[PDB]
Scaffold this active site. Structure first.
Site, PDB file in Angstrom:
ATOM      1  N   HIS A  40      14.063  43.741 -43.493  1.00 22.76           N
ATOM      2  CA  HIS A  40      13.096  43.619 -44.577  1.00 22.76           C
ATOM      3  C   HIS A  40      11.672  43.900 -44.108  1.00 22.76           C
ATOM      4  O   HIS A  40      10.890  44.502 -44.852  1.00 22.76           O
ATOM      5  CB  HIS A  40      13.194  42.239 -45.224  1.00 22.76           C
ATOM      6  N   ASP A  62      20.547  42.955 -45.253  1.00 24.51           N
ATOM      7  CA  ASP A  62      19.139  42.890 -44.864  1.00 24.51           C
ATOM      8  C   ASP A  62      19.021  42.693 -43.353  1.00 24.51           C
ATOM      9  O   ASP A  62      18.541  41.670 -42.861  1.00 24.51           O
ATOM     10  CB  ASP A  62      18.411  41.787 -45.644  1.00 24.51           C
ATOM     11  N   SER A 114      10.351  35.118 -40.038  1.00 22.86           N
ATOM     12  CA  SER A 114      11.744  35.522 -40.160  1.00 22.86           C
ATOM     13  C   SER A 114      12.199  36.205 -38.878  1.00 22.86           C
ATOM     14  O   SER A 114      11.485  37.046 -38.323  1.00 22.86           O
ATOM     15  CB  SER A 114      11.927  36.456 -41.351  1.00 22.86           C
TER      16      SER A 114
END
EC number: 3.4.21.90
Lengths: 162, 52
Positions: A40, A62, A114
Site C-alpha cells: 500500500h 496488499d 505499517s
C-alpha cells in the site's frame, strides 16, 4: 531489559527502510526465505541490491514478496506459525491476542507504522501489522498470518490504513 | 476480402483474450503460495501448473 535489548539487536538487522520525499513511509521485513513489503505504501527501499531485484505484488492481499539474495541468507528471522493466546512482543509495546483478534491499548501506534513484525515469546515472527481500528480505549489490529500454507487477512470494521 | 479479414481478426482476438484470461487465472490461483514464508506447492499442483 535484556528482552528489549535483543529485540532492538534483531530489529537493527532485519527490518529495512522505505524512503520517499525526505520522509520514511514504510518498513520491509526479511521473513524466513522471502521479503515481505506491504504494497500500500510506495517508495524506494533504502538499500542497494534489495531494490535492484524483481518483486511479486498482490493487491488483494496488499503486499509484495521477494526472494533473498544468496548473500543475506544468514540474516534470517526464524518464521513460525504457532499462535497461542496471550501476550506478544512488539516494537511499540506488547500486543494482546485473544478471540482471533490482535489488540493494543488505545493509540500506542503511530500513523504510518505499517510493516512492524510481531515476535512471539521465543522471538519468532507471527504476523505483519497492516492497519488499526480504534474502539473505546483499545485498538484492533488488521494483520496477516501464515497459518499452514495460505495467508489469511483479518480486518475489523472502520480500520484506517497506515 | 472484407469478410475474410473480419473473420480472421475476430478469431485472433478471441484466442488472444481466452489465452490471456486463462494465464491470469493461473497467476491468481498460484499467487498465494509464493507469499507464504517457506512452504511448498503440492506436487500435483506443481505438475498441473508449471510451479517454479
Amino acid at each position: 531489559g535484556k528482552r528489549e535489548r535483543m529485540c532492538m539487536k534483531i530489529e537493527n538487522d532485519c527490518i529495512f527502510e522505505v524512503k520517499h520525499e525526505g520522509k520514511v513511509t514504510g518498513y520491509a521485513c526479511l521473513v524466513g526465505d522471502k521479503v515481505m513489503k506491504p504494497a500500500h505504501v510506495k517508495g524506494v527501499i533504502d538499500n542497494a541490491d534489495l531494490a535492484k531485484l524483481a518483486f511479486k505484488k498482490s493487491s488483494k492481499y496488499d503486499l509484495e514478496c521477494a526472494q533473498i539474495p544468496v548473500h543475506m541468507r544468514s540474516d534470517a528471522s526464524k518464521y513460525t506459525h504457532e499462535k497461542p493466546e496471550g501476550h506478544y512482543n512488539w516494537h511499540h509495546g506488547a500486543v494482546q491476542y485473544s478471540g482471533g483478534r490482535f489488540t493494543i491499548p488505545t493509540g500506542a501506534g503511530k500513523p504510518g507504522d505499517s510493516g512492524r513484525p510481531i515476535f512471539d515469546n521465543k522471538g519468532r515472527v507471527v504476523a505483519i501489522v497492516l492497519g488499526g481500528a480504534n474502539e473505546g480505549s483499545r485498538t484492533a489490529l488488521s494483520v496477516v498470518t501464515w497459518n499452514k500454507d495460505m495467508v489469511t487477512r483479518v480486518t475489523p470494521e472502520g480500520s484506517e490504513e497506515w | 476480402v472484407s469478410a475474410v479479414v473480419g473473420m480472421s481478426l475476430l478469431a485472433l482476438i478471441s484466442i488472444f483474450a481466452s489465452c490471456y484470461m486463462l494465464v491470469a487465472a493461473r497467476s491468481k490461483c498460484l499467487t498465494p503460495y509464493a507469499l507464504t514464508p517457506g512452504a511448498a506447492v503440492p506436487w500435483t499442483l506443481g505438475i498441473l501448473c508449471c510451479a517454479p
